[PDB]
Design a protein around this ligand. Structure first.
Ligand SMILES: [Mg+2]
Ligand SMILES: [Mg+2]
Ligand SMILES: [Mg+2]
Ligand SMILES: [Mg+2]
Ligand SMILES: [Mg+2]
Ligand SMILES: [Mg+2]
Ligand SMILES: [Zn+2]
Ligand SMILES: [Zn+2]
Lengths: 37, 47, 142, 221, 59, 162, 38, 43, 97, 168
RNA sequence: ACCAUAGUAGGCCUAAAAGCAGCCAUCAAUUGAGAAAGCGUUAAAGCUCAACAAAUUCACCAACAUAAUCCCAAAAACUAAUA
């Protein structure tokens, strides 16, 4: 159905890094749980 | 308790540099000690 | 004083919530907009609730832009179902083809947001596939 | 600018009941017979539970101490509401309190006997882990709210990962092979130089002057 | 040139000179800076005084 | 050293940049291979708060510090230089670089107390009333510990507290 | 104000300033975030 | 006005007295002599 | 471009910037250009038109801004840095108007 | 007497303290600091997938457009950039944006050098595939604060007036 | 520092759940922006994070009130010390 694995997209294709960005983001979304100002 | 204590052998195993430092001869043990008492008996255990 | 996003059904415009609390707080006439919005949307007998953009001005008058009706509805109608799956992706609700998503794509290519976007129908199709996958409706390409 | 590959957990196995179990006020077979307090069971380095089991995170004890029930309550409550039961799980690395502690009420003249049993307590040696947390989490979050838990412990304590821990142990031995001064505590203690053994306690031959009373000084080489 | 003393550190600020009248509440703490402000001679005189042996000949 | 100039003329305003001549680094550095401006001139662990001729080379006409990224000093030597600058100032050296204020020279205060090796600001320090006996002492700080690495011809480590 | 052993910025507009040999937390948005190191 | 509780050097609270650079020296000096000693006692 | 928008630019008549792209010193005048061209600065006033004059031949970067104190502000970019022209923009055009 | 373990940290007997002061950790002290030594040896960075994708993408971008016009990026509302995009879509003209970081090393190789001083500030690359100049400057006439900086046209670089000339 | 639009107020619940009461999915437009980490709203609207774009890099693991007659050698950065 839906695309899931990021290992199946070519590192030489423009749309592989989009998921890398999305994951780098979710990372920061996680790290910001504890950050309270 | 405080005791007679003891020394683990390895202490007395000389390294090769020490022959150069203290001027010993690696090959031949010296024959006779000169001993002097540098510090005092008192405050040390009777033995 | 601002803008209002209001998703409203075809022939239904009434002097009560959401239009009472949302529009009536801006100081806006509810009857004027009922008459205008019904004037435009009575002419869709395809019965499609459309998200509409209501610009509410400084002097308490207002202006309207009608956009294309929600993909939630076009695909609710495309799969023949009623309400989308309870846990989406765990449970199947309804089904569509490469034709369904194509229809809902070209119908919606004139949307306020997709208009200034020159993206081909491939793009809008993957968009509607995206709006499908969380609605619980599965795609089958034939 | 520059993107980097994210760490992904395809290996994370999340158990049922991720939260900490309820530890009991008293044992179920309350010790009838009053015990001597070996203070020595808090004295010096831990033998047991120096190492990990399942998880990559823990609260590490940098001094020896006594954990009683209240503390357990602190930890259980705090950790449980500060974690996502989906992506994390925690572990007791320490038993529930078994060790009696005695009291006499106020206004007692000395002696007459032992008092009765007030507590139950669990001894911790420095170098032990109180709580093991595994999960698909990055360390930074767990660290963030676990340091809260650490700091409220009776002894000084820390939050650590496999990486962090091995980093600091590696460092620890490195310091001691890099030492410029010819004179180490071990060196003098074993060799009983300056008759120092008069002043030193036998346990020191092991502890090498790094452990003092219940305390631990990591700076001590 | 007694007024022209140099004081290393912030000592101007934290060295205090104390003395007592002998009357209750007659006790006096004074910043070095203040003291020297009032009487230039004092600072040095106290240094030298406090520096001699403590017997009579000091006087 | 680029002077910024401003002109007010007949309800019009001209604001413009003009470049002066930047003196150049002297010809022959002792450690040409060396990195930080200090370190190639062999000046590390030498200069003290007492060296102006070195110090005045990094600061601004009105006396403040330079930005490090402009001077490019090893972070350490930057902080060292900073402290020494403040110290030298408090020491009433570089009287030149006090900011020029036509009214303020007039209002006399008691002739400024001559001090040196002063680590703190004179306004902040609280007077220590309590001294304390030989086993608990309150040590009056002298110099900055940042300078504790300067070479001692005496072999006696510099005394930072009394 | 308050006197504290531990400062923390309680918001975004909180900032950290060393005055009179102490640390201060000053906040324009809220006065209530004002803290003073002891 | 800062006092020491009880007796100077005795109890659970003591006059603090610090190690001297002098002291460091004396100790090292002895250690030196004894390193040499346990050398000459080796062989 | 925050420092400009915060200050209520509505006292300005017209902002024009004459600069010459292929020179190596043109960066800062561009930083000024996109500083004042920002949306907040743009919509603080509807009476302010911004006109960007582009020349290969001119060789001299400059900016001219007029405002209703009868004031004509001419800042001549040669060696002027960006934050400086914006600082002077700030102190000059706000305190007067 | 105090038990061998206490809460309060337990004063040491003097000679043991002496022993401590002697046995203190001493860190190895360098002859010359490593940082103030000359620079470290050389650490080559390597091309990512994104660097290669953008090099290929740009190598195609200077090929396919007959007119590549540098337009300094300038702050507008999302409404105005979407509108300017659509009014770019009525004459079919394209607009692309590239990071200066990977954009700089490409035009610093051989042919296009005259474009380097243009890309210093913000920029926005205008792609014109089978262009007409008057249509391009047309919408740039509408917004007065949105300058056209010229640059590359079919291997020949030209400023604003060169464009005003290609138009008529 | 800057900047913030898109299907889409994602399905399901619900008085309304609109990113931001709770369960699901984590989709895909743009070169680029989480079916959202903070706040906020009755639901919104509204503020910042991350996303590009422009840049510069120098960092990280921070701190803790006082006693009762009157402070408690005076002092002091350096001429050479295995004294
Ligand atoms: Mg603690
Ligand atoms: Mg006594
Ligand atoms: Mg005592
Ligand atoms: Mg005893
Ligand atoms: Mg996308
Ligand atoms: Mg919205
Ligand atoms: Zn250096
Ligand atoms: Zn605040």
């Amino acid at each position: 159905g839906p695309p899931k694995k990021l290992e199946e997209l070519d590192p030489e294709t423009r749309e592989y890094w989009r998921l890398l960005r999305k994951h780098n983001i979710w990372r920061h979304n996680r790290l910001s749980k504890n950050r309270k100002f | 308790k405080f005791t007679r204590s003891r020394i683990p052998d390895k202490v007395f195993q000389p390294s090769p540099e020490d022959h150069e430092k203290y001027g010993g001869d690696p090959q031949y043990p010296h024959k006779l000690h000169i001993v002097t008492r540098i510090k005092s008996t008192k405050r040390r255990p009777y033995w | 004083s601002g803008m209002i996003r209001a998703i409203v059904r075809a022939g239904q415009a009434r002097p009560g919530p959401p239009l009472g609390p949302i529009l009536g707080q801006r100081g806006v006439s509810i009857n004027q907009f009922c008459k205008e919005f019904n004037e435009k949307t009575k002419d869709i007998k395809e019965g499609i609730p459309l998200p509409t953009k209501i610009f509410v001005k400084p002097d308490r008058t207002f202006e309207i832009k009608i956009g294309q009706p929600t993909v939630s509805y076009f695909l609710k109608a495309a799969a023949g179902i009623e309400k989308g799956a309870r846990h989406t992706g765990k449970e199947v609700a309804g089904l569509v083809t490469l034709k369904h998503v194509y229809e809902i794509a070209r119908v919606k290519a004139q949307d306020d947001a997709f208009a200034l976007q020159d993206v081909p129908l491939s793009s809008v199709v993957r968009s509607i596939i995206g709006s499908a996958r969380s609605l619980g409706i599965r795609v089958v390409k034939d | 600018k520059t993107l980097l590959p994210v760490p992904t957990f395809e290996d994370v196995a999340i158990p049922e009941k991720p939260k900490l179990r309820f530890v009991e006020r008293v044992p179920l077979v309350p010790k009838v017979r009053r015990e001597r307090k070996n203070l020595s069971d808090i004295r010096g380095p831990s033998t047991e539970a120096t190492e990990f089991t399942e998880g990559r995170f823990a609260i590490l004890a940098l001094g020896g101490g006594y954990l009683h029930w209240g503390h357990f309550e602190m930890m259980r409550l705090t950790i449980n509401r500060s974690m996502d039961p989906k992506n994390m799980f925690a572990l007791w690395r320490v038993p529930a309190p078994f060790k009696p502690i005695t009291r006499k009420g106020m206004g007692q003249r000395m002696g007459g006997g032992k008092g009765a049993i007030d507590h139950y307590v669990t001894p911790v040696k420095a170098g032990r882990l109180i709580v093991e947390m595994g999960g698909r989490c990055e360390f930074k979050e767990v660290q963030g709210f676990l340091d809260l838990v650490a700091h409220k412990l009776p002894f000084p304590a820390k939050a650590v990962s496999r990486e962090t821990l091995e980093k600091m142990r590696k460092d620890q031995e490195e310091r001691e092979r890099n030492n410029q001064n010819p004179w180490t505590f071990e060196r003098i203690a074993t060799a009983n130089m300056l008759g120092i053994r008069k002043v030193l306690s036998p346990y020191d031959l092991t502890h090498k002057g790094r452990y003092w009373g219940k305390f631990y000084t990591p700076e001590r080489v | 040139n007694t007024r022209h003393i140099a004081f290393s550190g912030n000592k101007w600020e934290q060295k205090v000179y104390s003395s007592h009248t002998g009357y209750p509440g007659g006790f006096r703490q004074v910043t070095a800076a203040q003291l020297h402000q009032k009487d230039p001679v004092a600072i040095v005189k106290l240094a030298i005084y406090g520096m001699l042996p403590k017997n009579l000949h000091r006087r | 050293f680029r002077e910024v100039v401003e002109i007010l003329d007949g309800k019009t305003t001209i604001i413009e940049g003009r470049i002066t001549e930047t003196p150049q680094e002297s010809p022959n550095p002792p450690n040409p291979t060396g990195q930080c401006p200090i370190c190639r001139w062999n000046l590390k662990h030498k200069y003290n708060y007492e060296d102006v001729l070195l110090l005045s080379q990094f600061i601004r006409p009105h006396g403040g510090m330079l930005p490090r990224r402009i001077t490019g000093l090893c972070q350490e030597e930057h902080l060292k230089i900073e402290e020494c600058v403040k110290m030298a100032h408090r020491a009433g050296l570089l009287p030149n670089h006090r900011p020029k204020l036509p009214e303020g020279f007039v209002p006399k205060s008691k002739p400024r107390l001559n001090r040196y090796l002063t680590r703190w600001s004179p306004r902040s320090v609280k007077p220590i009333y309590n001294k304390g006996h030989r086993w608990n002492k309150v040590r009056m700080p002298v110099g900055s510990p940042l300078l504790k690495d300067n070479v001692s011809y005496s072999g006696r480590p510099l005394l930072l507290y009394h | 104000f308050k006197t504290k052993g531990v400062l923390k910025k309680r918001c975004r507009d909180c900032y950290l300033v060393k005055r009179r040999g102490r640390w201060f937390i000053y906040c324009k948005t809220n006065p209530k975030h004002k803290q003073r190191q002891m | 006005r800062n006092r020491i509780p009880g007796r100077q050097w005795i109890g659970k609270h003591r006059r603090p007295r610090p190690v001297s650079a002098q002291a460091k020296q004396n100790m090292i000096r002895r250690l030196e002599t004894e390193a040499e000693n346990q050398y000459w006692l080796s062989r | 471009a925050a420092a400009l928008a915060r200050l209520g630019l509505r006292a300005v008549k017209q902002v024009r910037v004459q600069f010459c792209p292929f020179e190596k010193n043109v960066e800062s005048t561009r930083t000024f250009l996109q500083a004042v061209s920002s949306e907040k600065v743009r919509c603080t006033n509807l009476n302010c038109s911004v006109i960007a004059d582009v020349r290969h031949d001119g060789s001299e970067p400059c900016v001219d801004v007029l405002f209703g104190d009868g004031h004509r502000l001419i800042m001549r970019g040669a060696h002027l840095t960006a934050q400086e022209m914006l600082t002077a923009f700030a102190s000059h055009i706000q305190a007067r108007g | 007497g105090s038990k061998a373990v206490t809460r309060h940290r337990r004063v040491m007997h003097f000679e043991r303290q002496k022993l401590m002061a002697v046995t203190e950790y001493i860190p190895p002290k360098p002859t010359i600091n490593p940082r103030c030594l000359p620079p470290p040896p050389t650490p080559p960075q390597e091309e990512t997938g994104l660097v290669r994708l953008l090099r290929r993408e740009i190598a195609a971008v200077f090929r396919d457009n007959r007119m590549i016009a540098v337009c300094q990026h300038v702050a507008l509302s999302a409404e105005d950039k979407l509108l300017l995009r659509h009014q770019l879509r009525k004459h079919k003209i394209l607009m692309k944006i590239f990071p200066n970081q990977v954009l700089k090393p490409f035009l610093e190789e051989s042919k296009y050098q005259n474009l380097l001083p243009l890309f210093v500030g913000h920029n926005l690359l205008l792609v014109s595939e089978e262009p007409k100049v008057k249509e391009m400057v047309r919408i740039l006439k509408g917004i007065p604060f949105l300058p056209l900086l010229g640059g590359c046209i079919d291997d020949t670089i030209l400023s604003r007036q060169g464009f005003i000339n290609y138009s008529k």
